[PDB]
Amino acid sequence: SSCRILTSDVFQDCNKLVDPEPYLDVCIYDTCSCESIGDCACFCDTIAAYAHVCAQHGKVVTWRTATLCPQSCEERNLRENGYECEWRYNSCAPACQV
Amino acid sequence: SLSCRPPMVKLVCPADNLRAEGLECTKTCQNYDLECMSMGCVSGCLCPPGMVRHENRCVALERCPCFHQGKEYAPGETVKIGCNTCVCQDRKWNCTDHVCDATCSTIGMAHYLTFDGLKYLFPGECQYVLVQDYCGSNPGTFRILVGNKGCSHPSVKCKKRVTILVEGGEIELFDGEVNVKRPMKDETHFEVVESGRYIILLLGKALSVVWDRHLSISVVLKQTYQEKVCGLCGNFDGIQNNDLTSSNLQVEEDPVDFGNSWKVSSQCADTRKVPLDSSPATCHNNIMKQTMVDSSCRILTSDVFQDCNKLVDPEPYLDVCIYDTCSCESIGDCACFCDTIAAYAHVCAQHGKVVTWRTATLCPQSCEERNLRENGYECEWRYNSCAPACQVTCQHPEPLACPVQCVEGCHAHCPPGKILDELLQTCVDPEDCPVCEVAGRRFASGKKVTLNPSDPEHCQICHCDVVNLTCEACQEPG
Amino acid sequence: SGKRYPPGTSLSRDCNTCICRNSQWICSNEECPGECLVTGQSHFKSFDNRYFTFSGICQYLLARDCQDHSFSIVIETVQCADDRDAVCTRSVTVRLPGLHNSLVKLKHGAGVAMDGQDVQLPLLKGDLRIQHTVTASVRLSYGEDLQMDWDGRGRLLVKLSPVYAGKTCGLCGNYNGNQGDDFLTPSGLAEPRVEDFGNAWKLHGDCQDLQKQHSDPCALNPRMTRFSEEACAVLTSPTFEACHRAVSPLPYLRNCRYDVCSCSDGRECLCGALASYAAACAGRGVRVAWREPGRCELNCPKGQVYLQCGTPCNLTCRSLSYPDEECNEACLEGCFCPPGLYMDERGDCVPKAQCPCYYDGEIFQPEDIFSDHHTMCYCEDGFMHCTM
Amino acid sequence: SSTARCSLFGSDFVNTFDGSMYSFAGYCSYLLAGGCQKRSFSIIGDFQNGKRVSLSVYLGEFFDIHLFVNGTVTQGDQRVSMPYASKGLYLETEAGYYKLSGEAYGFVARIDGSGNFQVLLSDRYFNKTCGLCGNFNIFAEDDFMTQEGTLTSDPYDFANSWALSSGEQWCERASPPSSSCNISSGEMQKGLWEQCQLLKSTSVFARCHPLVDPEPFVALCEKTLCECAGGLECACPALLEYARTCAQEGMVLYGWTDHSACSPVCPAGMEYRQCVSPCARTCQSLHINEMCQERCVDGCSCPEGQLLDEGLCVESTECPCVH
Ligand SMILES: *[C@@H]1O[C@H](CO)[C@@H](O)[C@H](O)[C@H]1NC(C)=O
Ligand SMILES: *[C@@H]1O[C@H](CO)[C@@H](O)[C@H](O)[C@H]1NC(C)=O
Ligand SMILES: *[C@@H]1O[C@H](CO)[C@@H](O)[C@H](O)[C@H]1NC(C)=O
Ligand SMILES: *[C@@H]1O[C@H](CO)[C@@H](O)[C@H](O)[C@H]1NC(C)=O
Ligand SMILES: [Ca+2]
Ligand SMILES: [Ca+2]
Ligand SMILES: [Ca+2]
Ligand SMILES: [Ca+2]
Ligand SMILES: [Ca+2]
Question: Where is this region: E1 (chain B)?
Fold first, then answer.
């Protein structure tokens, strides 16, 4: 059931382009074998691998919430005493900037 | 040979007295009140009768320190254990007698920490009396209950339901929010402080409830009761080994027969006596996994908690960690692990030891979604390790009785001259609060209460909805 | 305990009685005696039924009367194997200020030594009696408010009657019914760290105080990890089914795995820990038959036979010499021999024909005619028939 | 340096990390090395009766590879094949001799054909470990600190402190063997004093003296040249050790086995080279280079051609295929 996030309301755009059946078989295989205890990374990394392929075909996606694979970004805005708050989690931003 | 130092004088065993308590019974500050064995003395050099040894120094006066946690304390110095101060004027600690405010808990899915302090295991699936007051020969004011579904084996299942019955009311909570099925009469004492990750919830002068929105139930009671309650949390008497007095008025030894006495529905299923073992179901005959879980639960004994481990024993909160996340099949949400450590960090916070144990690769807890409804990203909400739960807002501008010093969670922080309201998510200037001041005096922001029931002739009522400087007319009884 | 009883019944705990009336047991609150217990390596039990562990090496104070000074007990711990997590009891020292201000000492055997002098048992002084129990364990009994048990291989016990309610202090606690205050150092303040509690009762300053009490010594000897699981898995097996609802087994299981991995020989460390549980199940009413040729059946000599529940009153040959004395003893477990045979001093047990007499302490043979001028006495079959 | 070395060479002898030899004819399992404050692993050595059998690595609480002279590497109780790579412990063969690498955990064990345990161990455990191969410090005299912590003068009761029993067998204190040499002295000390002496005389060994001292090595041999009857080969075990102990220090020696009349045992097709690469170019191999910059290791290997294929040297023309 939890690997059916790959077939959910938020991915319906990409499921028509990229078949999810390959990326689902990996999900069931990994997180069965994986004994996830503190870090739920053996699950959150198989979906991100599908979202990135969906992004290359122009379908940006925001699937990540606070109760599922949170990915905070607040520690980079810490070394300065004054909290400027410029670092943020952006769903799919350009990698090649200046 | 060595002529011993001036401050002390050598001794010699007399041939007559068997009681040659000399070098062997060297009285230091530890073993003065303690009584010592001795066969005969030795050819040592012992301090005079009026003084003792103290770490390679014969300290003269009987002023030597008063140890606690293996640390020095000069006479006159104080220590704060709980809500009491305690001074060693002399050589024994001299403490006050102000009994403090106790606290149940539900650490994980199936465990319970009584008031006096007794962790025990009780996996149930029916509805159970967590604590109440109608116990034996009393009026019966409040009847906090608790109810679990699919929670005999901890997992991503086991959502809790909580029905609290005070002042003829029925306010209950599950699935994140709190719901009022029947409002209670004296609304003045009611209060709800949705601050951070918790739902603090007052109900009177001597009652409070806390709820982490997921599983934990930490009811806080004051000095008022002192053996007036009973339930799964026990009687709140100080005696720590009578917290298993079942409903049928006897002490039991097996807690799985205890909580079965406190179920409401006397015809649902009573839980099964599990065969005892150090390994739960998933960790049963999976000794590989049983070490990866043990190691990860040693965060409770890590460099960041060393301050608290000296105050609060982690051995109770570790047994819960190994038990829950074995049984829990954590797949997408690692909450059956991250919630057992937060329960230890919060107890460490109540004793004044704030902790920052939470990183990006371990239980991240972002707070960026609240800073989203506005197109302009103002960035006032932040994860703060342990911030005060009882602050001032447009909805609760006055200071409230604050059972919890600080709490984890996302907290809105912005420069001064602005006060937080929850409906409009950001902080806003004070004047924008729907605040009420009718006929001069300071009070809350227009509570929906009918003041002054007592005297008919002095029935001078003045409500305030949001802003109105109004007063209503009383309907005469005649 | 998960079973139904009709109304009007009266089941009895070891402490007191309770009667069913209107689905509610009525119960008395009269005090009942406590038991501090040392056993295994370093495993203590307070009077208030607290369990803990403190592996220190010094002379520690176990118990003491602390408003007056009727007695004081002093344990003496030593390391006891190659490992560092193995600290067994070697001796215990008792002190009675009521009689000579003497000093009894229970040695690493079944031996006792008053004021340096070894002693043959029994030792009827005025108040204190010291005698064997199964002829393999000593039992001190001062007055009617104090008992003890063998400190040979380290299984000390005490029995304190309710006249000492709340007026004692030591590692074993206050004896006040409260289990939480027992970590109270002599400076009058409860400590949360056991490593602070025990090292505050040491009597000598030169002794090294410990910094950490370890919980898993099977890490230093990973060979015994497997064996320590299946070995004391019998403790939760249904062999002990009858006393899970009498005393919690989960600590007596926790204390096994610390003993079998730590000590030099895990054979008897196993079979002295399983008996720590049966000895508590039996102190509440439940006897268990847990002995096998594999699970450590003791070898009673050829004269004796194994026996589960028997009477240690008609066993010793001294009984026939002093028959009028009362034997208000329980139904104990040990090595006896059949009722036609009575126990002789030399390990063999014999019929009552050649069972000697113990007149005035003197051991007379089965036929010894014997007389001063005025009295006339003889030994017939165990008893000394005197006349005048 | 950044490494260490223990060796249990010949019969009953030991060589700690710091130039301290002795003899120990144990009876059961004993701890070679491993931490002392907290053990992530523990290397263990089983002795049947004086003579050794197995090397064992218990990786905390959950895993146990079991190599031995028996070579039939088992695990737990189930006999497995070889090679084997579970849990970050690659159980390979190098130069015809068996290896157990734990680079994640910081150790490299191995055994030769005769049976000579060896333990290369990292500098991360400097001052930390304690066991039958002593602590990894600079000094060589203090490295008998018992399981309690006690500098003992005896090299024997020490090793009997570090015993570790199981349920299958509980073990007692072994006794030092009563030497039969004390009566059968005869000529055996006159004519055979030379094979020990040639560690000092011959030029091929006459250059590690500024790195090590042969005085213990000649001392430990003279007590074991007396029980074996009719053989000069009884000196080469204590001599073979001296070769490696100088190699590990950063100064290797060459061709010393040409005239010594003792070569270490190896299976057919191969004999003892010195400083052969571990990345033996075998038959079913991929022709890739300049990844194997590892240090150079002693052990027996094939001739110049004659590539390896399943534990035997075979000519390069007859390289098979696989499917
Ligand atoms: C505690 O201190 C108070 C105030 O100095 C003193 O009155 C009292 O006697 C002390 N009590 C004890 C038990 O030392
Ligand atoms: C944490 O919260 C407290 C109380 O509101 C506040 O005083 C403090 O500045 C906050 N610290 C951080 C790091 O946000
Ligand atoms: C030697 O190896 C054999 C075959 O693997 C095994 O059956 C036996 O138990 C081993 N014996 C010892 C002493 O290790
Ligand atoms: C070894 O560790 C001990 C204890 O921490 C320390 O006292 C000593 O200086 C260390 N020695 C070396 C050589 O690092
Ligand atoms: Ca484009
Ligand atoms: Ca209580
Ligand atoms: Ca303060
Ligand atoms: Ca107490
Ligand atoms: Ca050394």
Answer: 25-70
